[PDB]
Write an enzyme that holds these catalytic residues in place. Structure first.
Site, PDB file in Angstrom:
ATOM      1  CG  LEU A  89       6.136   3.031   3.824  1.00  0.00           C
ATOM      2  CD1 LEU A  89       5.318   3.365   5.052  1.00  0.00           C
ATOM      3  CD2 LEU A  89       5.590   1.777   3.160  1.00  0.00           C
ATOM      4  CB  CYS A  90       8.225   7.499  -1.589  1.00  0.00           C
ATOM      5  SG  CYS A  90       7.822   8.939  -2.583  1.00  0.00           S
ATOM      6  N   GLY A  91       6.592   4.622  -2.646  1.00  0.00           N
ATOM      7  CA  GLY A  91       6.216   3.921  -3.861  1.00  0.00           C
ATOM      8  C   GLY A  91       7.438   3.634  -4.721  1.00  0.00           C
TER       9      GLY A  91
END
Lengths: 285, 129, 130, 232, 128
Positions: A89-91
């Site tokens: 979910l860090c991009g």
């Protein structure tokens, strides 16, 4: 289209938006603590850098430039340090750093040099295991505010492989914290070239009571270790900033989907009421 | 009394998403969430048990002011029950005083304020949570 | 009257003024002073003392480096654990490092983010009928 | 009202929840047995809303302006009742409690309230320009809600701290002391003409009003009023 | 034979949500997902090729007793078709005895288990 399943979808997406807002604010808190840690750690490297500048200025003899000062010719084997987020979910940060590592490996193989990679964080380890090139040394489950002892487990291995001749050059790739909106990868070397912090602006001859060889042998591992620490801590700050931004975008997308699903649900309700009233009116007639 | 209750419940409803993350937050936000949880537990009520107006006023005066912060959240209902029993048996005069001047324009008068504060402090000293 | 700056990787220890230093250099203890001659030396696991108008504090540096110039003295102590820390263990410090840290600084954070990811993942496909 | 309009006066006709007029018409149509239409509303919904609301016009002799409260069924601006009402609306004011906790008397949300007449041709160039500028700065401030709350004021870049700073003063300056509010608050009433509002807000945006701290535009009329009164 | 199949497949329908887009699950959930995929793949059938009851029982006994873990998912269908072909050509007597005592209360008779696990092992040796 049933006016009830759409209600369930709206409820679920609203829950998604709320949990994502929670993620965003906690990640903002972690990003701020990480930036504070970066600032606190900054003075140590800030001082060691001009120490490296002066020492490199003094030591000019190639023979006495041993240990990490040997610009060995006929490069064969090179080691690279990749630092990745522990969780997802860090991009696009992990995609960026892993693509950078991949092109690095391809370029090094183009020069015929074997490569070895040590992975910080589970994602890098898993990516390199799946690619089929097992990392030699991995240090996962790293804390949010790690101590330098955590990075020692990889740093000492890398430098031991360097001294023994197993690896000839050392590189590190990490998610550079350009800004809270952009976190691009950045390559750095760990073979002190001339310490270009402030070049040789300071010119004071020092006495080496341990001795030149002893001083360099003791300090260069420490300098590369603090460089690795700085890169890892910068990468942690970039990770938290990128997660915050990704969650902000995800919350906005969830709210847009809530609006779209509410419009669809409203249309479904109006159609259902029209069918209701039309059927009862037809039954009346 | 109830303006503070309404404000705090609204604040909690704004941040209600952090019940499973209350500890891992700012100190002020943690305090707000804790207070909101205590108030919501306080509004729980069994059946066929109506609370007279003076009793509700006293309870909300306690809750709005920082009195239940020491109390753990799961025991707020028991706290309310036995505190009420204490007021009924130990300090009937406080209940009578609150009821008598309920219509006053400035309800927290010095006499009712100090009597209620003394009663609640005595109860907290006597009881353990 | 020299700018002493004991620094560390995790943080900065002190940056105050000093009258004298008792540096445990490898080949032999050396003193530093307001306008000391240039020196740059390794340290060993030992004992470093600083004098504050006649008050001695046993910092007990466990190793590192130091650079001395006639305007400031920089201690690059890799690992320094002040033996002059009664609060340590008794209140905060190491005690905080045990409970205020490595219990909720990462572990509570770890499982909280994990749980948030859990409910995210479950709701992502509890809605997978669109 | 039409008598007073025929006398050449200007009349305000306040209708409370015109949606109740719509649903009363729906019930009447159902009672008469007419076939229902598209939600159950009366088949003659448009014509009924046309018989009403078409006598609210500015004739040569006089004019009847109107301000009609409306209830949205559920929250569907696409529902036939609010849809047919919107077909006959020339302006929209979205009053908000959020502007009421912060005690501003007209609790009007400038970013949601709209009006057809707000274009350069009718209200002039300067009025439209200042209105667009106020909407722009308020929109920037709404967007920067997340930046200020998540992170804090320090992250705000240059020219964006100023935008929020001006947004505070704009939001407070919208407040006005009403001649009927002298019982609620005691401040004397004030009637600011439109041109005075345009000039005041233009001055606040391109100049004066930054060195004066906020919370001093509270309940003031023209920019001259706030300046003279609260710069002493 | 089908009770264990149904029970095992029920869990897949629940915890396929994490299977979808998460590769950070526990080992038990990975095992459940990987076992569920094998089963739902077995249910894939082309058209106009009914399987007699004995063939279904044989393949489902094999897949339920974990004999069908080594085979990769894309090749399960070819594996099963080859299994049918091997039974038809090599050993029809295992089919005959399965169909003969398909109504027995305790279906896994020792005589039935032999010549069925022997046959699947012979198939596995013969092919891969």
């Amino acid at each position: 289209p049933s006016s009830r399943e759409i209600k369930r979808r709206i409820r679920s997406v609203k829950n998604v938006a709320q949990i994502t807002r929670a993620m965003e604010m906690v990640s903002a808190s972690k990003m701020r603590r990480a930036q504070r840690n970066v600032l606190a750690t900054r003075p140590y490297a800030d001082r060691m850098r001009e120490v490296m500048a002066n020492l490199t200025a003094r030591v000019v003899g190639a023979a006495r430039r041993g240990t990490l000062l040997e610009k060995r010719e006929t490069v064969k084997s090179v080691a690279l340090l990749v630092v990745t987020p522990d969780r997802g979910l860090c991009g696009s940060l992990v995609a960026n750093v892993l693509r950078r590592a991949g092109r690095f490996i391809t370029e090094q193989r183009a020069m015929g040099r074997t490569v070895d990679v040590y992975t910080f964080g589970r994602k890098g380890r898993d990516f390199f295991l799946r690619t089929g090139f097992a990392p030699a040394g991995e240090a996962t489950r790293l804390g949010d505010a790690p101590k330098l002892e955590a990075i020692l487990g990889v740093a000492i291995s890398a430098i031991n492989g360097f001294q023994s001749g197993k690896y000839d050059e050392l590189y590190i790739i990490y998610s550079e914290f350009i800004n809270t909106l952009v976190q691009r990868p950045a390559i750095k070397q760990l073979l002190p070239v001339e310490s270009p912090d402030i070049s040789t602006t300071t010119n004071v001859d020092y006495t080496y009571e341990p001795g030149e060889e002893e001083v360099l042998n003791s300090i260069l591992p420490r300098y590369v270790e603090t460089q690795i620490y700085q890169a890892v801590l910068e990468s942690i700050a970039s990770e938290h900033s990128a997660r915050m931004v990704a969650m902000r975008n995800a919350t906005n997308n969830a709210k847009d989907l809530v609006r779209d699903l509410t419009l669809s649900f409203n249309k479904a309700r109006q159609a259902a009421i029209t069918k209701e009233v039309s059927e009862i009116a037809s039954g009346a007639a | 009394v109830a303006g503070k209750l309404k404000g705090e419940l609204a604040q909690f409803r704004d941040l209600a998403a952090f019940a499973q993350f209350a500890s891992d937050l700012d100190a002020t936000t943690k305090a707000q969430i804790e207070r909101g949880q205590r108030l919501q537990e306080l509004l729980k009520q069994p059946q066929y048990q109506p609370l007279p107006v003076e009793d509700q006023v006293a309870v909300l005066y306690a809750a709005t002011n920082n009195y239940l912060d020491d109390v753990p959240v799961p025991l707020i209902t028991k706290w309310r029950d036995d505190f009420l029993a204490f007021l009924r048996t130990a300090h009937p005069e406080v209940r009578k005083l609150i009821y008598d001047n309920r219509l006053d324009r400035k309800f927290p008068t010095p006499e009712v304020k100090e009597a209620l504060e003394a009663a609640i402090k005595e109860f907290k000293a006597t009881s353990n949570y | 009257p020299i700018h002493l700056e004991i620094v560390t990787a995790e943080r900065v220890i002190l940056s105050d003024d000093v009258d004298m230093i008792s540096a445990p250099t490898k080949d032999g203890r050396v003193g530093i002073l307001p306008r000391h001659a240039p020196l740059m030396t390794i340290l060993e696991p030992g004992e470093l003392d600083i004098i504050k108008n006649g008050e001695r504090t046993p910092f007990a540096v466990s190793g590192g480096f130091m650079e001395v110039l006639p305007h400031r003295v920089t201690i690059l102590a890799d690992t320094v654990e002040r033996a002059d820390e009664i609060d340590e263990a008794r209140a905060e410090q190491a005690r905080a490092e045990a409970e205020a840290r490595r219990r909720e600084a990462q572990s509570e954070r770890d499982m909280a983010l994990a749980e948030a990811k859990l409910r995210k993942e479950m709701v992502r496909l509890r809605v997978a009928q669109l | 009202a039409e008598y007073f309009r025929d006398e050449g006066r200007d009349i305000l006709l306040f209708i409370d929840n015109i949606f109740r007029f719509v649903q009363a018409g729906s019930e009447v149509s159902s009672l008469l047995g007419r076939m229902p239409s598209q939600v159950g509303y009366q088949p003659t919904l448009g014509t009924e809303m046309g018989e009403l609301q078409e006598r609210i016009t500015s004739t040569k002799r006089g004019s009847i302006t109107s301000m009609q409260a409306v209830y949205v069924p559920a929250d569907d601006y696409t529902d036939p009742a609010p849809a047919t009402v919107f077909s006959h609306l020339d302006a929209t004011i979205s009053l908000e409690r959020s502007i009421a906790e912060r005690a501003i008397f007209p609790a009007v949300d400038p970013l949601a309230s709209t009006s057809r007449i707000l274009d350069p041709n009718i209200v002039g160039e300067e009025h439209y320009r200042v209105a667009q500028e106020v909407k722009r700065v308020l929109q920037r401030y709404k967007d920067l809600k997340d930046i200020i709350a998540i992170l804090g004021m320090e992250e705000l870049s240059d020219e964006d701290k100023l935008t929020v700073q001006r947004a505070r003063k704009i939001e407070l300056f919208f407040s006005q002391p009403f001649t009927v509010a002298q019982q609620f608050t005691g401040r004397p009433g004030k009637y600011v003409p439109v041109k005075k509002t345009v000039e005041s807000f233009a001055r606040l945006l391109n100049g004066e009003g930054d060195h004066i701290p906020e919370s001093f535009f509270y309940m003031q009329g023209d920019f001259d009023d706030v300046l003279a009164a609260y710069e002493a």
